[PDB]
Structure formats: structure tokens, C-alpha cells
Design a binder for this molecule. Structure first.
Ligand SMILES: CCC(=O)SCCNC(=O)CCNC(=O)[C@H](O)C(C)(C)COP(=O)(O)OP(=O)(O)OC[C@H]1O[C@@H](n2cnc3c(N)ncnc32)[C@H](O)[C@@H]1OP(=O)(O)O
Ligand SMILES: Nc1ncnc2c1ncn2[C@@H]1O[C@H](COP(=O)(O)OP(=O)(O)OP(=O)(O)O)[C@@H](O)[C@H]1O
Ligand SMILES: *C(=O)CCCC[C@@H]1SC[C@@H]2NC(=O)N[C@@H]21
Ligand SMILES: [Mg+2]
Lengths: 247, 673, 261
């Protein structure tokens, strides 16, 4: 399987409308070598996907959001699953590849009573402490603190890419305009301006938060090359017996 | 392709799919700017990307996007297009659309409105053909009044009688009646069907031809009184009265019969004053007697196959005629050059009524454009999806050669080397038809699929040698994967000791049968011992390419590994048919005898949806019993309606499905007891 | 004759008042203290050294570049002090400036304090009172949150980290305290949730009070997020000093040994 194989089938896999959902497993199968993917916990916490695959013959760990289940929102079980998988991959020098399409965390009283904060911190810690090479691709959405939890550039990420349909923002347009334009009573133009100049990856690109805006059909060829140069990554951290994960 | 000649500089293609792509290609070769129309769903189609400009003309349904005349009109006015090509289907044979087009200033690539109106109904066409001195199917002119009318008409015109709808199309609204009771019940049934679907309630009574051959004659005319016949075409392999396999020359016709049919078609075209490209279809019995059956006033779907043997670009000729130029060819300039065969690759499952529409997204798509004598007409690219709103056609594959044998061999090779992953297709049926002994000999008819597969299509039946070759290839692939799994990079800390194994002893389960295989590897050559037979398999063993070419005892075979599991399950497309095998080691096979068989409960007690689509009619209530052949429900999808039977008799415990729903594939409908 | 000297005094007197006297009175009416009062209560008298007093936000969108939208300090007071003679680094979020929302300057000050603390090897104490991310900032607030999270994870197991929530914390402001070693809450005045009750009603279609959703009792009795809850601010700071007396300054130091009787 050539490392520069194009994947034109991913050019239109993301629907134009944000309400319609797609299967992230299709993208994962298209990107990896020979379309072979070993999924871990495929029937538990289905809003997130973790597994092992190969890129140019090298073992890689894959973490991704599943928009089909619960619109891709993060919850307690998915957070724990992804956190432990990421910790295992980091502990044994396995590179991590992340596909990000998340609108935030699942709301509700049950999640708050169950300690969603602790498990979200678990996942954020797992992505933050990883010293193995990590490559992140944003497909459609990355909203709020979840965008930080999903291996952003600012967590010592190595390479971050955004598809032309990516949307990196603090929150949705309606909440942002209702919290900013409290009494402007001019929502008709506020919606247009906000969706024109924020509902796109440009604010993240101009600040350098994403390395490039790439065509989906070149995703695989973009990742493999990165894995060629990040194989010798070495970082230094302060000494400690062990840290205190929020378990 | 002379660019000096002046033609319209803006043509709008009022169609979609492969025909739009073909028209755009021809216009681009002629230096003509194109304009494309599309719906919201077809926003990333091939034709919208390969054509200059694009206009969204409505939502997904055809009745609001491609049959919506108004949107087409504002698109034409905004784009200032000088010409419009309708292709086939949709509004191509709509007289009122042609009238509205010709109203303001727009020229129409196609026949005059009068010609379409003449060849719009199946009654007036018969009288006009009779007035044009063209052989016609015997029958009674005029609309049959009632049941007693039909039963007294049926007496004189043979024992078999054919009941047809005046406004019928797409192989619909037609029935065969043998006895008087059959005639009188079919009259009412077809009247109701025409009222429900066609909304015309006019019926035609005619003679039924036994074992007929459907022969088309392609005619080209201009606005100066010149008409030419571009040889014939054989279109006999049909299911649901829809063609799948076509041939440009006819192995059944000689020079004299071909000349007579062409002359009759030209006479009919002159009588109707045809001034575009069209086709005249005939039914021919065993005694080489041909009878006129319908005229198509548009471009035929199977036109490209007759382009290979004539060397003409039909779309270019249509455009030139629409401009006003006369024909630049004479009847003596038309000649047969070789042989050409065309197959329609559809997105349907051939194991269910010779094709059942299926939805999905195309993960992999590869055409065999590099194979000799291969042409592909497709509006499909990787990543395309198949919806329930349009025709399920994926591609048209055409192969030409010096004779029929070469064309058929190239067709088989192209079908073997053609990759579709994401949807179910009919390539198995297409490849099985072209290698059939009856088809190879040339003794075929319209009822070919119905008597070659009386119990439905089942796939390629392997012979002993073919089964041995398939088993050897599967075992060699399994051993190749196992050997590849042992190739790690050097560690220099814990060196890898490769397992030095000489013979791989395997148990291969195929269909319901177990075979003992002994495989050995010497470089790229595998020696395979299958049940007392020795075979040699040679290949490069590229485990990532979708197509794998192997040499078994000198015979070259192209196989596709569709899926593979660590448990031993493998799906291999071989000779066009997908076979599911299970490969285990001898120790694993011996230990598998202790495994308990898990409980599976189908027992034909649950009936799910045979295809996805929209439910139209339901006739089953919970608690009510059913019997064999009892109609359960009707689903409409991709231009066709299917109503399923019940199967074994029993009591319907519950009915999960409801009328007007959107039921997908593998969704429970009836839990009959 | 230059007005640079009077500018310094005006800027200091503006920074000391936070978001204005009216907002200080509004905070007092709610039963809460200001950030500087909390810092003064926490630390030994005459031991607080403040840093980045004149730092202001650099946002220039939605009219935030106006003079009335500029506050020195920018909703956070950061510095170093001593508790019973032992060095500690402290930051206190000021709710009177844009509701305590986190901006680029806020995150920069917090990151500077944590970096200096990890450089010298001293604990970090954070008084949290913030409404979340400043929406006008945009992705800058997300980047600041991510930087704070990265520094929290890096310093985990190196220096002790204590969090004390003294107000309504929402959005991404709830994840930094979760990464710290210990979390304390103030009864009836502190909250911790990711989404407010209005979003819960909009999505889940259920009615819940803010105290019910994220109050101190909820997180100290049936959630496992907080460790202790205290009656009010003064009691919380006294107990925080008492608890800080137990811990060592760094993981390189042995367990503290005090005089025993
Ligand atoms: C990365 C994660 C994110 O995107 S978090 C986005 C922020 N999420 C929110 O839900 C809005 C935050 N505010 C709130 O939830 C409530 O107002 C809470 C925190 C309960 C305040 O309660 P309360 O004690 O009654 O104070 P208040 O309602 O009178 O508000 C006072 C002023 O604070 C301001 N404020 C608060 N948060 C922000 C913020 N993120 N950005 C900008 N301003 C904020 C408010 O504008 C409010 O202004 P004003 O004085 O009422 O005019
Ligand atoms: N009189 C007949 N005798 C035998 N078969 C017949 C007769 N009339 C029609 N058929 C069968 O019906 C098929 C379709 O006929 P016909 O072309 O008239 O239908 P249609 O739906 O109008 O076609 P199209 O899709 O080309 O517009 C023929 O190919 C043939 O198999
Ligand atoms: C609908 O969206 C696709 C129409 C497909 C047309 C096919 S091919 C030519 C036949 N004539 C017709 O009206 N339907 C058939
Ligand atoms: Mg026909």
C-alpha cells in the first residue's frame, strides 16, 4: 500500500448541512493501510472510536468522534475509554492520530451528577501528557473546551490540519450572538456577519492554530509524511515519581 | 471535429448522470460552452464539475428538479444559453416542453413537436406506420371498449393476446392473456393500473409474438429531407422489460433483412418528417419476419455501441442538425466495422428478481480504461452516492473488436478488471450472460433470463477444475498473508526467529463442503495440493491492490479479495462471482469440532425489506393470516415498484411497517408466526 | 513636565478598584469578597508581591477596543506570598471585570505565575470565580484555556495545586480545578457545571436549579468532584491556610515535620 495513495472518496463525505451525520469509520478505513482497522470497545460508548491501525506499516493508535451516535458529543464513558486508550498508546511509543468532530459535552443532570468534569479532565490529561507524536485532523466541528480536549495545537500537538468544512469556534452562532449582542436587537445582520467571519477555519488558521487547510483527498499522504519526520521526536519534562491523574 | 464550422456557443444539458457527461464531452470536443443543471443532492456530481457553470433547479425529487420546467426556463434565461440538449428520459420526449422552448427563442436538439406527438401514443403510431407501408403487429385498430370487446377481438388474432397501455413506458402497463377469462380480468386490471399510474385508461389489444427478438434501427435525419439508417442493434437480454446487454451488429440478421428493415425505418422517418436522431424498434420471430414496435424520438441509451461499428459521434450529428446543417454522409458511406457489445452496470442485487435497487456510497471505484478495446460511459466517481430518486445506473461498458468472439472476450476481461466497492452491482449476472453457451452461439430471445434461470439468478456454477483453481488461489492468498505477517523490522534487542514451516496443512470450507489443502511456497510460486490434485499459482502477491492477477497452471485469472477476517472467513470475487470461503489450519479445524453451534432463529418467520425506499401500499393487518404468493407490501425506489410475497403460510403476529414510511435495507416488516 | 507619573497613579487606583465601586457593592451584596480581599486574607500580612498589574487585554473586536472596555489587571490578580513563612504562588479571578471571563491577558498572567512557581518549586493556589471564556476574544480564550491545562498537567506531581471555587464557574473554567490535586467549595455561593440550567432545559427538557445542578452540596455529597465545603469566604480561607500547613512545597522535599508536644 503506497503511502501517497489519494483518497478522493473523502472529498464529499462531510455533508454541507450541520444537522446531517456521517460515519467516521468510513474515513478511518479510507485513510489507513489496506483499510484494516482493529476497533477497541466497538459496542461500548459508541460516540467515540478508538483502535489500532497501520500507516506505512507502522502501528498507530486512532481516536475519533462519531457524529452518528449522540451527534458526536463527549460523555463519561467515551471520555474514560479514550483516555485509557491514549494513555496505553503513549506508554508504549505508539503514535496517535485524532479525527475531531465534536460540538461539546453531553448536557443533562445525569452527566453532572455522575461527575462528567472528572472524566473530561481524565481525557484532557491523557491527551496533554502524551509525548508520542500526535497528528490531529478536524473534519467538521470543534466547539468550546472540547476542542482543547481533542488534542489541539496548544497541548504540545505536533501537526494539526483542518478540512475546508472545519469550524473552530467558542460556541454556536446563536449563543455567541445572544451573549454578545444582548440588546443590539439586530440579529438579522448579526447572524450573517458571525457565520460569515467565524463559521469557518479562518480564525484558527490566521493565528496558526492549524498548520494548514488541506484537501480531504490528500489526508493520508499528509499523515504518512508527518509520521516519517516525527518518529524521532524527543521531549523533556520535569522529574517526578508520578503525576496525579484525576481518576 | 472541425472547429471552423460555426455552431451554438452555449448549450444547456437538461439531464443528469452519464448522458449529461457524454453530451458535455461532445460539446467540449466541439468547442461549445456548456451549462449544467442539478438538484441539491447532485451538487457534487461529475457533470456539474466537468461543465462550465451550474444551476440548482430544485430539491432532490425529479418532479421538482428535473421535471420542473419553470426552473429550467429561468436557468436558460439567466445563462443565456442558445441551445438545450435533453438527453434521454425526463423531458426529452415532452412535446409541451419543446413547444415552450421554441416559443421565446430557444432551439431544441431533438425532433419537432409534431413528430413527438405522432410517436407519443401507441395507437396513432400503428395507423401512421400502416400508412407508411411498414410491417405492423396484427391486431384491432382503435381503443377496446370493454371486456366483451376484448374477448371477441381475441378470437381472430391468435390464441395468445397482448394487452398494452397507450401511455405506457419503461416496460410497464403490459400483460399477456391466454384464455378468455384471462382477457376479461386483465382488461379491468390493466385499466386500473393505467388509471393509477399513467392516468390515461386507454388500452390496446394486439397479437403476441412467441420467442421474439428485439431489433433496433438507428435513424439520423435532418431538416432537408435526408434520412439514413445506421445499421441495426440487438437488444434482447432484458429483465422487467429493460435491456441490460446489447450488441451493435446482429448475429441473427443477414444483409437483405437488415437492408429491408433499414429501408422501412427510413420510410417511417420520412413519413413522420423526422429531423433528428431516433430509433425504430422491431420484433422478429424465428422465420425472420419483423413487425414494427414503437419509435423513440430521442437519443437511445445504447447508442454508443452503434458508434463503434460506424465511427460516428451521434451527439455531434444531432447538434449539427439542430444548427441547420445537412447530413454529410450518404447511405453508401455507412458500413459495419467489427463488432461491439455493451453492458449496463447497475446498482442492484442480481440475486433478487434479476436486480433490486440498492443504495450506498461508493468507497472505491475503478474502471478498466487501460484494457484493449474498452470504453466506459459513466457519471460516477469515487465518493459518489446512489439515492432513491434516480435511475440506479452506474455505468455503460462497451467493448469492440474485429468479430463477436474478440468483443466478448474483451467484455469478460473488462468485467473482471472493474472495481466497485460500496454498493451491490449486477456484474455477476452480466459476466454470466456473456459466457453462456446459448448467448455465445447466438440463439437468444427476449425471454432469455426467464428460462436460463427459472428459479432466479444463483451465480457462476464452478466446474471441478474451476473449483480446484479457486481453492488453490484462496489457500495461496491465505498463506501469503500469513507469511507477510512475519516480516518485522530489525529490533537489535530481541531478534525475530521466523517460523521455519515447510507445508501448510489447511481445511477449506466452501459452500457446504470441506477440502484438505497442502500448500508450499518457493519464492513467488505456490504449490497447492487440493484433494489429490496438484496446482501451481504464480503472482506478485501484492496484498494491497484491489485487483490480483494470478497464473494457475498457465491460466491467467483476475481475482478480488473483498474482505478478510482473522477467523478465516474470506470473500473472493472470482470469474465475476463472490464466493465465501473459510480457511483454517488442520489443528484449528480439528479443535473447532468441539465448538458449540450458536442459536440462530430465522425460520422464515421474519420478513424484512428486500430493498430500501418508500412504502406505497400495505395490505396486511396484524393477526390476519397469509398464504403463498400473498402480496405483503409495495415499495417504490429508483423509478421501480416492487411488492413482495409472503412465503410459507402463517399468521402475521405484527406489522412493524406502515404506509408512507421510509424503510431501509434489512428492516423488520412482518413477524409472521 | 510630563504626566507619566500621574498616569501611573491613576492606573494603580483604577486597577485596585477592579471593575468599579458599583460592581464591588454588587459583589458584596451577594455575600462574596473581592479578589484582593481574598488574597489579603489568604496570605501573611505584608507579604503579597503582585505581578502584571498593568496588563490589559488586546482584543479589538465588537467594540472591546474602547476606553470603557479596558481594565488594568484584566479580571485576575496574580502574585506570590507567604503562608506561615512558606512561599506560595496565588491567582484570584476578579468577577467584576467582564464577569471574570478568561481572555488572553488573564491566561497569560496565570501561565506566568505557574511557570515561575514550577521554576522555583512552590505550590499554586487558585481562587476561581469566572463565568467562562470571553466570547469576544474568540479562539484566543480557547488557546489560553489549553495553555493553562497543559501547565496544570505538566506540574502535576511536581508541585501541589489547590483550587478554591468561590463563585459561579461555567464552561471551560471547570476543567483546570479538576486537574488540580484538591478542590474546595464555598456553600451557597459557588457553582461548578459545564452547561447552565437554561441549556439543560432547552436540550434535555427538564427543570433544575443552578444550586441543584452545580452547588457545593451536589459536588461534595453525590458527585465526587469537590473535597470539602465551607460556610463562607473567611472560614474557607482560614481552613485553606490550615490545610496548606500540611503539604510540602515540592515533590523534591520530604513531608513537613512540625514541633510536637
Ligand atoms: C470554552 C467554554 C465556553 O465557551 S464558556 C461560555 C460562557 N457560558 C455561559 O453560559 C455564560 C456565562 N455566564 C453565566 O453562565 C451566568 O451569567 C453566571 C455565571 C451564572 C453569572 O451569574 P450571576 O452571579 O447572576 O452574574 P450575572 O448574571 O449578573 O453576570 C454579570 C456579568 O458577567 C458577564 N459575563 C459572564 N460570563 C461572561 C463571558 N464568558 N463573557 C463575557 N461576559 C460574561 C455577563 O456579560 C454579565 O454582564 P452584565 O453585568 O449582566 O451586563
Ligand atoms: N406484441 C408483443 N409481442 C411480444 N412481446 C411484446 C409485444 N409488445 C411488447 N412486447 C414486449 O415488451 C417489451 C417492451 O415493449 P415496448 O418497447 O413497446 O415498451 P415500452 O415500455 O414503451 O418501451 P421503452 O422503454 O423503449 O419506451 C418488448 O421488448 C417485448 O419484449
Ligand atoms: C430518472 O431520474 C432517470 C430516467 C432514466 C431513463 C431510462 S432510460 C430510457 C428509458 N426511457 C424512460 O423514460 N426511462 C428509461
Ligand atoms: Mg421499447
Amino acid at each position: 500500500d503506497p503511502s501517497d495513495r489519494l483518497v478522493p472518496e473523502l472529498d464529499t463525505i462531510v455533508p454541507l448541512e450541520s444537522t446531517k451525520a456521517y460515519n467516521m469509520v468510513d474515513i478511518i478505513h479510507s485513510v489507513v493501510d489496506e483499510r484494516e482497522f482493529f476497533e477497541i470497545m466497538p459496542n461500548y460508548a459508541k460516540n467515540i472510536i478508538v483502535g489500532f491501525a497501520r500507516m506505512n506499516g507502522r502501528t498507530v493508535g486512532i481516536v475519533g468522534n462519531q457524529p452518528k451516535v449522540a451527534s458526536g458529543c463527549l460523555d463519561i464513558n467515551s471520555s474514560v475509554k479514550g483516555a485509557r486508550f491514549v494513555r496505553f498508546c503513549d506508554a508504549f511509543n505508539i503514535p496517535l492520530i485524532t479525527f475531531v468532530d465534536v460540538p461539546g459535552f453531553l448536557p443533562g443532570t445525569a452527566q453532572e451528577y455522575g461527575g462528567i468534569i472528572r472524566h473530561g479532565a481524565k481525557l484532557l490529561y491523557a491527551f496533554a501528557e502524551a509525548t508520542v507524536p500526535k497528528v490531529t485532523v478536524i473534519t467538521r466541528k470543534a466547539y468550546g473546551g472540547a476542542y482543547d480536549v481533542m488534542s489541539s495545537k496548544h497541548l504540545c500537538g505536533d501537526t494539526n490540519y483542518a478540512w475546508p468544512t472545519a469550524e473552530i469556534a467558542v460556541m454556536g452562532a446563536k449563543g455567541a450572538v445572544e451573549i454578545i449582542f444582548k440588546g443590539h436587537e439586530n440579529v438579522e445582520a448579526a447572524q450573517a456577519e458571525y457565520i460569515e467571519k467565524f463559521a469557518n477555519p479562518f480564525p484558527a488558521a490566521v493565528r496558526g492554530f492549524v498548520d494548514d487547510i488541506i484537501q480531504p483527498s490528500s489526508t493520508r499522504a499528509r499523515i504518512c509524511c508527518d509520521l516519517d519526520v516525527l518518529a524521532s521526536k524527543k521531549v523533556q519534562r520535569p522529574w517526578r515519581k508520578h503525576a496525579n491523574i484525576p481518576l | 471535429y472541425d472547429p471552423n464550422e460555426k455552431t451554438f456557443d452555449k448549450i444547456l444539458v437538461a439531464n443528469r448522470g452519464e448522458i449529461a457527461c457524454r453530451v458535455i464531452r461532445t460539446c467540449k470536443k466541439m468547442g461549445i460552452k456548456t451549462v449544467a443543471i442539478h438538484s441539491d443532492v447532485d451538487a457534487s456530481s461529475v457533470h456539474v464539475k466537468m461543465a462550465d457553470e451550474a444551476v440548482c433547479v430544485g430539491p432532490a425529487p425529479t418532479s421538482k428538479s428535473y421535471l420542473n420546467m419553470d426552473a429550467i426556463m429561468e436557468a436558460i434565461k439567466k445563462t443565456r444559453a442558445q441551445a438545450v440538449h435533453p438527453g434521454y428520459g425526463f423531458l426529452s420526449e415532452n412535446k409541451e416542453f419543446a413547444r415552450c422552448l421554441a416559443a421565446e427563442d430557444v432551439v431544441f436538439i431533438g425532433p419537432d413537436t409534431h413528430a413527438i406527438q405522432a410517436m407519443g401514443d401507441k395507437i396513432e403510431s400503428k395507423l401512421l406506420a400502416k400508412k407508411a407501408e411498414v410491417n405492423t403487429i396484427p391486431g384491432f385498430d382503435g381503443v377496446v371498449k370493454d371486456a366483451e370487446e376484448a374477448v371477441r377481438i381475441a378470437r381472430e388474432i391468435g390464441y395468445p393476446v397482448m394487452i398494452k397501455a397507450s401511455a405506457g413506458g419503461g416496460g410497464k402497463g403490459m400483460r399477456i392473456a391466454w384464455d378468455d377469462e384471462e382477457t376479461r380480468d386483465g382488461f379491468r386490471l390493466s385499466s386500473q393500473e393505467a388509471a393509477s399510474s399513467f392516468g390515461d385508461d386507454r388500452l390496446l389489444i394486439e397479437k403476441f409474438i412467441d420467442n421474439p427478438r428485439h431489433i433496433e434501427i438507428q435513424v439520423l435525419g435532418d431538416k432537408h429531407g435526408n434520412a439514413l439508417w445506421l445499421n441495426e442493434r440487438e437488444c434482447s437480454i432484458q429483465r422487467r422489460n429493460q435491456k441490460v446487454v446489447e450488441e451493435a451488429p446482429s448475429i441473427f440478421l443477414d444483409a437483405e433483412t437488415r437492408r429491408a428493415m433499414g429501408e422501412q425505418a427510413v420510410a417511417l422517418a420520412r413519413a413522420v418528417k423526422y429531423s433528428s436522431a431516433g430509433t425504430v424498434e422491431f420484433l422478429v420471430d424465428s422465420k425472420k419476419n419483423f413487425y414494427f414496435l414503437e419509435m423513440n424520438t430521442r437519443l437511445q441509451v445504447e447508442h454508443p455501441v452503434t458508434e463503434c461499428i460506424t465511427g460516428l459521434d451521434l451527439v455531434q450529428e444531432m447538434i449539427r442538425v439542430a444548427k441547420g446543417y445537412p447530413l454529410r454522409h450518404k447511405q453508401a458511406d455507412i458500413r459495419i466495422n467489427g463488432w461491439a457489445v455493451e453492458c449496463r452496470v447497475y446498482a442492484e442485487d442480481p440475486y433478487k428478481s434479476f436486480g433490486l435497487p440498492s443504495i450506498g456510497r461508493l468507497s472505491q471505484y475503478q474502471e478498466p480504461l487501460h484494457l484493449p478495446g474498452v470504453r466506459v460511459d459513466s457519471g460516477i466517481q469515487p465518493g459518489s452516492d446512489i439515492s432513491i430518486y434516480y435511475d440506479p445506473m452506474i455505468s455503460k461498458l462497451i467493448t469492440y473488436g474485429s468479430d463477436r468472439t474478440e468483443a466478448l472476450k474483451r467484455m469478460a476481461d473488462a468485467l473482471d478488471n472493474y472495481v466497485i466497492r460500496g454498493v451491490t452491482h449486477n456484474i455477476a449476472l452480466l459476466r454470466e450472460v456473456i459466457i453462456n453457451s446459448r448467448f455465445v452461439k447466438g440463439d437468444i430471445s427476449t425471454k432469455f433470463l426467464s428460462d436460463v434461470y427459472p428459479d432466479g439468478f444463483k451465480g457462476h456454477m464452478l466446474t471441478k477444475s474451476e473449483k480446484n483453481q479457486l481453492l488453490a488461489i484462496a489457500s495461496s492468498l491465505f498463506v501469503a498473508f500469513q507469511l507477510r505477517a512475519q516480516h518485522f523490522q530489525e529490533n537489535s534487542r530481541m531478534p525475530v526467529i521466523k517460523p521455519d514451516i515447510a507445508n501448510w496443512e489447511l481445511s477449506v470450507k466452501l459452500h457446504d463442503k470441506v477440502h484438505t489443502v497442502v500448500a508450499s511456497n518457493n519464492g513467488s510460486v505456490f504449490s497447492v495440493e487440493v484433494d489429490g490434485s496438484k496446482l501451481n499459482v504464480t503472482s506478485t502477491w501484492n496484498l494491497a491492490s484491489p485487483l490480483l492477477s494470478v497464473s494457475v497452471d498457465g491460466t491467467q485469472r483476475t481475482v478480488q479479495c473483498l474482505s478478510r477476517e482473522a477467523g478465516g472467513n474470506m470473500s473472493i470475487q472470482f470469474l465475476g462471482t463472490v464466493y465465501k470461503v473459510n480457511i483454517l489450519t488442520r489443528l484449528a479445524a480439528e479443535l473447532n469440532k468441539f465448538m458449540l453451534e450458536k442459536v440462530t432463529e430465522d425460520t422464515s418467520s421474519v420478513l424484512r425489506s428486500p430493498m430500501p425506499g418508500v412504502v406505497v401500499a400495505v395490505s396486511v393487518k396484524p393477526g390476519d393470516a397469509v398464504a403463498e404468493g400473498q402480496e405483503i407490501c409495495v415499495i417504490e425506489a429508483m423509478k421501480m415498484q416492487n411488492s413482495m410475497t409472503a412465503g410459507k403460510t402463517g399468521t402475521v403476529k405484527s406489522v412493524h411497517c406502515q404506509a408512507g414510511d421510509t424503510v431501509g435495507e434489512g428492516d423488520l416488516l412482518v413477524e409472521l408466526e | 513636565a510630563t504626566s507619566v507619573n500621574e498616569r501611573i497613579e491613576n492606573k494603580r487606583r483604577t486597577a485596585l478598584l477592579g471593575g468599579g465601586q458599583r460592581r464591588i457593592d454588587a459583589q458584596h451584596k451577594r455575600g462574596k469578597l473581592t479578589a484582593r480581599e481574598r488574597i489579603s486574607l489568604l496570605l501573611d500580612p505584608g507579604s503579597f508581591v503582585e505581578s502584571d498589574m498593568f496588563v490589559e487585554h488586546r482584543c479589538a473586536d465588537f467594540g472591546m477596543a474602547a476606553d470603557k472596555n479596558k481594565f488594568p489587571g484584566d479580571s485576575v490578580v496574580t502574585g506570590r506570598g507567604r503562608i506561615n513563612g512558606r512561599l506560595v504562588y496565588v491567582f484570584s479571578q476578579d468577577f467584576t471585570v467582564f464577569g471574570g471571563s478568561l481572555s488572553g491577558a488573564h491566561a497569560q498572567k496565570i501561565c506566568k505565575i505557574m511557570d515561575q512557581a514550577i521554576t522555583v518549586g512552590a505550590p499554586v493556589i487558585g481562587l476561581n470565580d469566572s463565568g467562562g471564556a470571553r466570547i469576544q476574544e474568540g479562539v484566543e480564550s480557547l488557546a489560553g484555556y489549553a495553555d493553562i491545562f497543559l501547565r496544570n498537567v505538566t506540574a502535576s506531581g511536581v508541585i501541589p495545586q489547590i483550587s478554591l471555587i468561590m463563585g459561579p464557574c461555567a464552561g471551560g473554567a471547570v476543567y483546570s480545578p479538576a486537574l488540580t490535586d484538591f478542590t474546595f467549595m464555598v456553600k451557597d455561593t459557588s457553582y461548578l457545571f459545564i452547561t447552565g440550567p437554561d441549556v439543560v432545559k432547552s436540550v434535555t427538557n427538564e427543570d433544575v436549579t443552578q444550586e441543584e445542578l452545580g452547588g457545593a452540596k451536589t459536588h461534595t455529597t453525590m458527585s465526587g468532584v469537590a473535597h470539602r465545603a465551607f460556610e463562607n469566604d473567611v472560614d474557607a480561607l482560614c481552613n485553606l491556610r490550615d490545610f496548606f500547613n500540611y503539604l510540602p512545597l515540592s515533590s523534591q522535599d520530604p513531608a513537613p515535620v512540625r514541633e510536637c508536644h
